C-alpha cells in the first residue's frame, strides 16, 4: 500500500508436504492494483469457521 495505491501479487502451487515451506523458487505475478489513500497500522486475517 504505497503512493496512493494497493498492489496484490499471487501465485498458486500444490505441495505434497506438511512440514514447512518448500525449497523452491517462484516469482509472484501482479494480480490487481487499486487506488486507496488510507494509512494502515494493523491487519488481521479472516476465517470462515
Amino acid at each position: 500500500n504505497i503512493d496512493g495505491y494497493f498492489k496484490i501479487y499471487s501465485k498458486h502451487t500444490p505441495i505434497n508436504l506438511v512440514r514447512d515451506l518448500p525449497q523452491g523458487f517462484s516469482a509472484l505475478e501482479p494480480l490487481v492494483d487499486l487506488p486507496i489513500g488510507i494509512n494502515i497500522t494493523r491487519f488481521q486475517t479472516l476465517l470462515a469457521l
Partner: protein
C-alpha cells in the same frame, strides 16, 4: 479452501476508514468503508 478474508485499518471500526478484502468462492469481493465487524466470521 478455508482461509478467506482480510481487513485493514487503524482501529477497524465505523469511526475510521477501513478497507476489507474477502472471498465467498463465487468471485473476489473487496470493500473499503467504515465497517465494524466481529473478530470472527461465524457461518454454518
Amino acid at each position: 479452501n478455508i482461509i478467506r478474508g482480510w481487513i485493514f485499518g487503524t482501529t477497524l471500526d465505523s469511526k475510521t476508514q477501513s478497507l476489507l478484502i474477502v472471498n465467498n468462492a463465487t468471485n473476489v469481493v473487496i470493500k473499503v468503508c467504515e465497517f465494524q465487524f466481529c473478530n470472527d466470521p461465524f457461518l454454518g
